[PDB]
Amino acid sequence: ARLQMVKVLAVLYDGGEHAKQVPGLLGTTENELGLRKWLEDQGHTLVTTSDKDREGSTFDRELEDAEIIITTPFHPGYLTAERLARAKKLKLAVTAGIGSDHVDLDAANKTNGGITVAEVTGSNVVSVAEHVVMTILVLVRNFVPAHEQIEAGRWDVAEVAKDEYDLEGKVVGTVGVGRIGERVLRRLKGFDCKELLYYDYQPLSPEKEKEIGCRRVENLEEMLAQCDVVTINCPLHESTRGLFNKDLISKMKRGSWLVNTARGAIVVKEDVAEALRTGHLRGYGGDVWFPQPAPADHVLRTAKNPFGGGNAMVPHMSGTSLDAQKRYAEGVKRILDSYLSGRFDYRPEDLIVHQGKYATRAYGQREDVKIP
Amino acid sequence: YTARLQMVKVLAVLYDGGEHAKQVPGLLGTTENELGLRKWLEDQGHTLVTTSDKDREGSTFDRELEDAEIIITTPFHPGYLTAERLARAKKLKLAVTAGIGSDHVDLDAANKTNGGITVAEVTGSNVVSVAEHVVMTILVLVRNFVPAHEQIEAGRWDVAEVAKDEYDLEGKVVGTVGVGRIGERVLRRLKGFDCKELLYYDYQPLSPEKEKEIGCRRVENLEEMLAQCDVVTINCPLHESTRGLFNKDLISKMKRGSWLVNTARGAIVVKEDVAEALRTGHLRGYGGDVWFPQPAPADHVLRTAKNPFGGGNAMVPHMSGTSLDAQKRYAEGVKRILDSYLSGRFDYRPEDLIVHQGKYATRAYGQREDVKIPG
Numbered sequence: 001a002r003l004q005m006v007k008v009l010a011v012l013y014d015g016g017e018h019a020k021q022v023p024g025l026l027g028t029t030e031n032e033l034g035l036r037k038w039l040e041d042q043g044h045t046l047v048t049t050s051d052k053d054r055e056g057s058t059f060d061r062e063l064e065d066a067e068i069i070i071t072t073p074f075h076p077g078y079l080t081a082e083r084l085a086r087a088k089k090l091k092l093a094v095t096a097g098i099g100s101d102h103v104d105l106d107a108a109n110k111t112n113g114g115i116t117v118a119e120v121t122g123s124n125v126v127s128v129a130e131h132v133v134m135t136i137l138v139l140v141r142n143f144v145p146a147h148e149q150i151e152a153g154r155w156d157v158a159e160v161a162k163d164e165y166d167l168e169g170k171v172v173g174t175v176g177v178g179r180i181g182e183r184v185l186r187r188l189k190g191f192d193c194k195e196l197l198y199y200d201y202q203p204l205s206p207e208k209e210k211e212i213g214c215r216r217v218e219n220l221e222e223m224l225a226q227c228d229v230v231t232i233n234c235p236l237h238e239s240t241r242g243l244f245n246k247d248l249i250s251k252m253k254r255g256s257w258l259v260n261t262a263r264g265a266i267v268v269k270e271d272v273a274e275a276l277r278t279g280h281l282r283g284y285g286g287d288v289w290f291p292q293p294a295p296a297d298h299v300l301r302t303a304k305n306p307f308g309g310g311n312a313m314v315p316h317m318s319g320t321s322l323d324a325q326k327r328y329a330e331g332v333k334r335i336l337d338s339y340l341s342g343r344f345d346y347r348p349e350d351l352i353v354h355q356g357k358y359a360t361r362a363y364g365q366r367e368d369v370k371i372p
Numbered sequence: 373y374t375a376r377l378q379m380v381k382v383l384a385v386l387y388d389g390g391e392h393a394k395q396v397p398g399l400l401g402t403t404e405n406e407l408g409l410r411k412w413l414e415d416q417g418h419t420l421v422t423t424s425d426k427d428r429e430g431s432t433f434d435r436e437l438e439d440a441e442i443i444i445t446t447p448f449h450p451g452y453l454t455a456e457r458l459a460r461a462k463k464l465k466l467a468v469t470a471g472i473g474s475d476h477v478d479l480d481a482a483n484k485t486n487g488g489i490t491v492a493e494v495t496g497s498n499v500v501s502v503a504e505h506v507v508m509t510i511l512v513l514v515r516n517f518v519p520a521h522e523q524i525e526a527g528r529w530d531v532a533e534v535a536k537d538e539y540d541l542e543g544k545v546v547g548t549v550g551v552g553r554i555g556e557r558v559l560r561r562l563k564g565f566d567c568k569e570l571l572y573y574d575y576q577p578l579s580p581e582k583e584k585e586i587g588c589r590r591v592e593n594l595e596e597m598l599a600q601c602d603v604v605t606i607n608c609p610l611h612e613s614t615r616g617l618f619n620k621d622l623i624s625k626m627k628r629g630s631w632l633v634n635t636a637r638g639a640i641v642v643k644e645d646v647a648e649a650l651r652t653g654h655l656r657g658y659g660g661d662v663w664f665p666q667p668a669p670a671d672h673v674l675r676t677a678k679n680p681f682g683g684g685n686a687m688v689p690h691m692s693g694t695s696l697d698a699q700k701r702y703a704e705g706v707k708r709i710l711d712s713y714l715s716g717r718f719d720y721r722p723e724d725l726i727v728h729q730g731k732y733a734t735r736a737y738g739q740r741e742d743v744k745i746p747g
């Protein structure tokens with residue numbers, strides 16, 4: 001028996017005129033992931049908002065009787081313990097994308113009998129892996145200040161060649177070798193890095209290690225000390241919040257490059273900025289911030305190395321490329337259909353928490369994980 | 373025993389590193405560091421004059437080239453060896469490029485100068501560096517990085533504004549014009565990105581084994597290739613048949629909203645035609661590091677041209693082949709070529725020669741009859 005007259009609340013980013021001009025912007029308040037007719041034809045209701053941060057936000061009002069809440073990491077409705085305690089009807093929290101750390105998952109497990117938190121696993125992992133390799137190259141090859149010199153009408157090859165290196169012969173390490181981290185290594189293979197390294201408590205198979213040509217390092221600090229480039233590709237959970245602080249960054253090589261497309265809160269922003277300021281890091285880049293939207297005065301918008309380069313920051317966009325949005329929009333529909341049909345026939349890999357327990361190994365090494 | 377040549381006048385035209393080249397000694401290809409050649413030459417009894425002053429009427433270059441026996445140039449700051457200048461270079465026997473691409477020499481005039489001068493370059497020295505730069509530039513354009521970074525530095529936040537022109541490289545068709553040392557290395561780096569297809573156009577094909585190893589397909593007609601690609605990268609030398617190749621007519625054969633990358637030479641494109649294609653949205657993006665002439669004039673149109681959304685420009689100064697890792701290799705290669713000449717052996721690597729003994733010594737500067745490949 002299908003569930004009936006279900007209230008769905010979606011918190012998405014505002015596409016303004018862009019989302020009218022470019023209909024491929026599915027993940028916007030304008031286009032609503034292409035869900036509205038599909039839901040309404042079944043007798044369900046959909047409320048969509050981008051208003052999610054202020055006291056008495058539309059989000060705060062609507063979450064009190066939503067049965068399904070759709071969020072998206074690029075404009076995250078933070079499902080705090082306080083909000084979940086007020087979400088009296090909530091059964092399913094769907095992430096339109098990947099990374100459900102904007103939900104208090106421990107509170108979700110104690111809410112309304114244990115809510116299901118699902119995301120579209122695999123939907124945008126290629127998009128992010130491409131973004132990582134791009135960002136690595138932009139930082140290593142000193143692109144940003146070089147492009148700024150050209151647009152300013154200047155010409156000084158030595159000024160920007162003095163901090164320009166090749167990625168060939170450099171050691172690159174990934175923190176996390178899941179769907180993104182493995183795909184990063186697969187794209188780096190053709191660049192003839194000296195070594196490709198990873199750190200993860202969930203290792204690659206020996207066959208994948210040989211196919212890609214990479215090596216597992218058992219200790220994070222020992223990996224950092226060997227790398228020229230470090231890329232962060234793990235989820236945000238209690239043990240990764242503030243992991244990259246001044247003490248851990250100090251284990252990276254002087255003049256190294258750090259890339260973070262995972263989550264902003266995995267780094268300590270003031271520690272990254274200080275490392276750049278003194279030249280301990282040559283560069284930092286990526287697309288993720290805490291909180292989002294990034295405050296207008298966030299220090300990593302403008303932090304530079306001592307040469308006035310080393311910043312390859314963008315807004316949170318890598319996982320919301322036009323190609324990615326088509327995939328996560330289709331995946332949200334599939335998850336919604338699992339719930340609304342009354343089958344509850346979720347793909348196991350889509351579940352983060354379910355029936356009062358963690359349903360993943362990827363949010364830290366836990367006891368009391370129930371894989372369905 | 374062969375007798376070494378004696379008291380040879382070497383002229384080097386290199387870029388000025390200012391304070392940078394004192395701070396960072398790895399800037400070898402500068403007037404400050406002289407490719408690490410000075411002691412090595414002087415200990416043999418040779419002389420070295422080095423300058424960056426190469427463009428103005430009565431430049432140091434113009435004065436010194438009249439009795440230089442060896443002229444070292446570098447593409448990043450090219451001493452243009454015009455027919456007029458070569459006619460005045462009465463002692464010139466060897467022109468060495470510190471890097472790759474010798475189109476800043478009039479090679480037809482070089483073949484008629486002093487019985488045919490040797491023009492050599494450091495083949496392979498910075499091909500990896502450039503191929504990396506191409507893949508970086510493709511990703512920067514496809515993923516709309518530049519306006520996104522600008523939004524952040526300005527204190528703004530609007531994901532839709534920059535995601536609306538953000539694509540993945542996965543599933544796109546990429547084609548290279550030229551599948552030589554750089555073009556092949558571009559395709560090798562693109563392999564892991566799961567492009568829909570990798571294409572090339574070159575009258576010198578890859579072996580069938582390499583086509584299958586990389587996973588790429590030869591297209592027999594350039595316009596046929598362009599019409600199939602989402603991304604086009606130019607990786608061929610500048611010669612008569614590639615000067616102005618990418619004009620309005622050829623660019624019109626590319627797909628609407630395509631991305632064009634040029635790390636080869638600026639004069640292979642018609643800059644006004646690229647700018648117009650970008651401005652009308654026929655190109656989504658143009659990027660690379662090469663310009664004509666160099667240094668690029670301060671008002672060069674491709675410094676500031678944008679697509680209709682205010683993005684699509686990934687231009688940098690001529691730097692990809694002069695990364696710190698590249699400079700170590702081409703500096704060592706220039707020394708090797710100089711030693712072949714100065715030793716009196718003339719035992720050049722064949723692949724380093726562009727013209728030699730009055731004939732083209734390469735197949736890469738157009739399909740020619742009267743090519744004499746040494747060996």
Ligand SMILES: NC(=O)C1=CN([C@@H]2O[C@H](COP(=O)(O)OP(=O)(O)OC[C@H]3O[C@@H](n4cnc5c(N)ncnc54)[C@H](O)[C@@H]3O)[C@@H](O)[C@H]2O)C=CC1
Pocket residue numbers: 097098099100122124125128175176177178179180181199200201202233234235236239240261262263287288316317318319320361362363364
């Ligand atoms: N910038 C963007 O738009 C996007 C960012 N993401 C972020 O990237 C994360 C990873 O995504 P996937 O690779 O698809 O997830 P995944 O679940 O396939 O892989 C994550 C890996 O991280 C590992 N990990 C967990 N804690 C770790 C630690 N302390 N040290 C090293 N490894 C650890 C897990 O064991 C797992 O193998 C997401 O959770 C999300 O936060 C994902 C997609 C979009």
Ligand SMILES: NC(=O)C1=CN([C@@H]2O[C@H](COP(=O)(O)OP(=O)(O)OC[C@H]3O[C@@H](n4cnc5c(N)ncnc54)[C@H](O)[C@@H]3O)[C@@H](O)[C@H]2O)C=CC1
Pocket residue numbers: 471472473474496498499502549550551552553554555573574575576607608609610613614635636637661662690691692693694735736737738
């Ligand atoms: N941006 C930078 O710093 C650098 C740029 N370059 C430029 O890249 C060029 C290529 O370098 P490599 O690949 O090392 O040379 P290469 O000689 O190995 O390969 C060039 C290829 O282009 C092909 N070609 C010639 N005319 C063509 C046409 N009309 N259509 C298609 N293919 C054509 C040749 O047949 C040859 O296979 C250099 O000649 C130089 O102009 C090279 C190094 C540094």
